[PDB]
Subunit: 497 residues, 2 copies
């Protein structure tokens, strides 16, 4: 077999990216400042963190085993609990004490036959008393919110229609439905997309099969009152390339950024309309809604070239690290229209941004606050000379958060400091009476001076100021998505505004 | 109540001394080099690590909650398991989410009445399928070797005669007895010493009550074939000073270093002889044995002033940090002699040393190999300009290990590097056929460059060279004592030579 290294080597696991791989508890975390005593609930986040050194050299950050952090808040005290998801991958490699799963999304490179290849490392959501650890090539893994015990692969009482479950389901605050989909829904390289929803009782509601114009990556999607919307990233999969040891994904300069629109309820596959936005990279959806005229306003990060530069086009053509910027775009769509091409989008701010969050109490409805990560190249904001040699590679950099008010147009910027970077933020309603976007924001910080992580707490009244700074004595390697589960919310999700 | 800080402040918890306070697992530790595949067993060590910030400012290092590390070795793989001892202190302070126990060994400063004040932080030994977490003001706490679960305060099936159990019991390799004692055996300020042993069946054998000339600290002791020996450190306890908020311990320049000698079997209290060594500090016992003439050779670290400088004499007279050196002393005693004063000891090497270990297969018998920590002030060995501002205070420094052959007089010295310091080493017999002192040595390293810990593995054939270097991604705060439990030894202790 390919030799399994006994320590981590490569830029993707160097410095702050070096895996720690701890599981357990750190209770009563050190706090500078004061955590508001009214805050009660848990911040769950997930990071890729390889448990064993890969036999693939420069294994991308996206292929690391999912490790779940939970920050449990009550009366101004906070405890950390940390535990790996017991994926099939994790368990079999642990038993073997060596890596066995090979390249990202390529089963033909695995050293043993896997039934489920999930690393469960992309998102961690709350649904009906369980956490669901998500990875878009697989079903979810279900976990205990309190202990982080892994229950196992989850199929919604045998109702799951698809081989795949998106990392970005949406939670309707009014209907209490979880709105889902999966792409490559019938296996590697398939153009099948399964759109499906579950009601708050756990029963499957919608199930609609449709066909993608290309086998392209659909990472995120958007839900409005009457429509679901699928933006396709121009990364394309050829199974025959994979069979020869090639990458699952490869960029295609020849195609638009397709944006499918399906009616949300009672449709068939042939009701989908594949609109054609100008070529570019579909980033994360902040939110979408229908305006007064019945048109879809889709707000999302959007870039003009391949953000995932490590999977270039057929001739190796693509951008370099740090070259591509994504911007906060509004796209307008009309399901009625028969004009397939779409106009260039209007942009809401000029910042290089990603990881947008809203107040999820207005998800699927008109929103007017958005919180997002920014990467500000303005001199001095990040001390690159100090940070870069300690940072390693593979992971996106964000050196502040921004709060946009869409009514006023005001932006507030939180800048943790010249030697700190941020992950994705969460928003927490102040209480169940609070106005849209009024509450607290938390965000995990990489502190390159200490080589430690910190959890910052911010009041939306003044995002520039840390109300508290929770000081972890270990590193939490840069991660992907996270969510707040408030104690006062019985189903884990906030009440509609 | 005194306010409980919400983060750690002070030299005693700064830099590398900052508590981490994690519990759990890191499996499959990164290894540079190669761990010998024949090594099978567990290295258990204990560190003081305050779980909550004290309300006492500059609480000494000795008053931190005991956290047990276990390094589990098999076929060249190693896993870390880490867990706090569930002392009464730990549990009640966890329940309260604030510190409640006050000053070192002073119940009059506690905010609540404790039954047991143990931090269980000094040593961790194996006895009859349990670990015993030791602290000399208390009985042991018993723990599971495999899971590190705390069973609770342990009293040897209700046979424990003493309120106190030494942190330095001795394990007779021939009789398989655990030889024990406790000082302050009837409570704070008592001059009662209980000497007691247990046979390998768990039944109590010896129990002898004797009287100390002063209420002085007896940290370590020594056991030979026919005698037990109690060196008394000139730190003295006055309960009335304690009732006023004062220190449990205070140095006394007016008294000798008493060395009691009792016959090991069948004695009464009045059989003890209190010999009077020249005034000085009784450090750790390497080992003691009876020679050809029936005389006791007691080999121990010995200093000429108060090593514990933070508890000075009644007028605050005492040394400064880094001033006092301890040296490897041989003392000769004769139980027959009626001459109480003893000669100045002969010294075995020149080095400033502490933490001596032998091959425990010859404990109580003549030994000819000793392994010990050294602190070499010679310029270059330690890059103090770099280390000191990152180190914090409270804990002893050691910048190498030494191996002395007592027959040949040869010394080998392991120097981890200019920016690394060491804890106490363990010795591991190569196999059950191995000669005295032939095997492997492990030692935990503080790496001030990475701010990480590392576990070094050395072959006694060449102590200057690391056979393997196990790289932890977290800090293990400097600790106290540790032990090896070999898999091939059914009762946890090696077979007599
Ligand atoms: Co995502
Ligand atoms: Co000791």
């Amino acid at each position: 077999l390919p030799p399994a290294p006994r320590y981590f080597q490569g830029e993707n696991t160097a410095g702050f990216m070096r895996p720690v791989r701890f599981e357990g508890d750190i209770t009563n975390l050190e706090v500078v400042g004061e955590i508001p005593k009214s805050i009660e609930g848990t911040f769950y986040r997930v990071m890729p963190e390889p448990h064993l050194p890969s036999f693939i050299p420069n294994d991308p950050w996206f292929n690391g085993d999912g490790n779940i952090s939970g920050f449990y808040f009550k009366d101004g005290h906070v405890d950390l609990k940390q535990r790996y998801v017991r994926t099939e991958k994790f368990v079999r490699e642990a038993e073997a004490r060596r890596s066995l799963l090979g390249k990202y999304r390529n089963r033909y490179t695995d050293l043993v036959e896997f039934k489920i290849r999930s690393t469960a490392n992309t998102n961690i959501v709350y649904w009906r008393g369980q956490l669901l650890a998500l990875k878009e090539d697989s079903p979810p893994y279900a976990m205990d919110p309190e202990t982080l015990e892994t229950f196992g692969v989850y199929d919604f009482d045998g109702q799951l229609p698809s081989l795949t479950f998106t990392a970005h389901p949406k939670f309707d605050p009014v209907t209490r439905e979880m709105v889902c989909f999966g792409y490559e829904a019938k296996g590697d390289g398939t153009r099948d997309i399964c759109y499906y929803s579950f009601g708050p009782d756990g029963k499957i509601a919608e199930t609609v099969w449709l066909v993608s114009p290309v086998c392209g990556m659909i990472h995120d999607f958007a839900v409005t009152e009457n429509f679901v919307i699928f933006p396709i990233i121009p990364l394309v999969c050829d199974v025959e390339r994979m069979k020869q040891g090639g990458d699952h994904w490869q960029w295609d300069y020849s195609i638009p950024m397709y944006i499918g629109v399906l009616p949300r309820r009672g449709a068939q596959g042939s009701d989908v309309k594949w609109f054609e936005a100008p070529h570019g990279f579909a980033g994360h959806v902040a939110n979408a809604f229908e305006d007064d005229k019945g048109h879809i306003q889709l707000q999302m990060a959007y870039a003009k070239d391949n953000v995932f530069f490590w999977w270039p086009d057929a001739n190796g053509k693509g951008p370099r690290p740090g070259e591509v910027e994504a911007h906060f775009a509004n796209f307008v769509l009309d399901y009625q229209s028969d004009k397939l091409p779409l106009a260039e989008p209007t942009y809401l701010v000029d910042d290089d941004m990603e990881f947008p969050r809203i107040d999820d109490r207005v998800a699927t409805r008109k929103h007017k606050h958005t919180f997002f990560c920014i990467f500000d190249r303005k001199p001095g904001v990040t001390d690159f000379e100090f940070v870069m040699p300690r940072a390693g590679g593979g992971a996106p950099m964000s050196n502040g958060l921004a709060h946009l008010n869409h009514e006023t147009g005001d932006i507030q910027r939180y800048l943790p400091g010249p030697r700190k970077l941020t992950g994705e933020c969460i928003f927490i309603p102040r209480n169940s009476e609070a106005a849209e976007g009024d509450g607290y924001v938390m965000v995990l910080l990489a502190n390159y001076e200490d080589m430690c992580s910190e959890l910052a707490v911010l009041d939306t009244k003044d995002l520039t100021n840390e109300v508290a700074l929770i000081k972890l004595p270990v590193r939490l390697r840069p991660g992907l998505h996270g969510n707040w589960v408030d104690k006062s919310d019985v189903d884990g999700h906030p009440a509609p505004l």
